[PDB]
Amino acid sequence: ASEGPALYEDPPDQKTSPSGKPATLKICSWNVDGLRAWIKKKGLDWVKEEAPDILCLQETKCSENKLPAELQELPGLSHQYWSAPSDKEGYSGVGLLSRQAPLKVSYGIGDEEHDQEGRVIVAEFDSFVLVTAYVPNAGRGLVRLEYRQRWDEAFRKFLKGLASRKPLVLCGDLNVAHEEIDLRNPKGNKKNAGFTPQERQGFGELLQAVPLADSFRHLYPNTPYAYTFWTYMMNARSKNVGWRLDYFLLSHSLLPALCDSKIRSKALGSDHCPITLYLAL
Ligand SMILES: [Mn+2]
């Protein structure tokens, strides 16, 4: 095609806040493209090396009653919560695994229409509430784009609610590359899922309304070729022809506790790579 390799090297982990406070929380989020495939691909061994405090997973494709038994070889993340489509089938699904149990775990966004596909887990902790999300793809041919706009609004209002109570951290596959810098080929994707003006706009609305800051882009406003997903086809990863779909968005109040927002480009196991957040809470 038009694209050859574009180099990207994630900078070293900055593990102290701007006030010099060492990070006390490490959160890892990962679209795993199937819990069972991911595990087969050694996803868990990378999790152990990373040693996060909280691990959030998206697209587990796994019924909450058919969890791989390997998920018990994680003694460090022993508190495990799962949401999968209410029809009990093998698609979508998210996970949240935690060293410490949260004060409370909830599922969905309190909207029946939007709560049947196991897309959202809310884990409330002392100083903050963590949400992980697997946002509805707009669909091939954009046949799900109208629903996705419904989804975007409900979700945006629900999050706005949470944040009014506690500092918010939202992470996961938000199924949109916000701006042109967020994907390798903006020009050819303006009509495809992930880069419609509708989706880009909803991400923008999400940021101002809650409000939320894009942790990675706040720290690296001018850094290009930083992606978290590459299609399996066309040898895309190897050419770094990708999209940034995975994010950590923070309440502005958490910005002084932001140490770094990382993209683990080399970590294999899915068509997305892990992202990792360091906070000094
Ligand atoms: Mn997938």
From Swiss-Prot:
Consequence the record notes for mutating residue 229 to A: Strongly reduces AP endodeoxyribonuclease activity
Cofactor: Mg(2+); Mn(2+)
Annotated phenotype, changing residue 273 to A: Does not abolish the redox activity
Region (Mitochondrial targeting sequence (MTS)): 252-281
Entry binding sites for Mg(2+) 1: 31, 59, 271
Family matches, as InterPro entries: AP_endonuc_1 (IPR004808), AP_endonuclease_F1_BS (IPR020847), AP_endonuclease_F1_CS (IPR020848), Endo/exonu/phosph_ase_sf (IPR036691), Endo/exonuclease/phosphatase (IPR005135)
Protein name per its UniProtKB record: DNA repair nuclease/redox regulator APEX1
Name of the gene encoding the protein in the UniProt record: APEX1
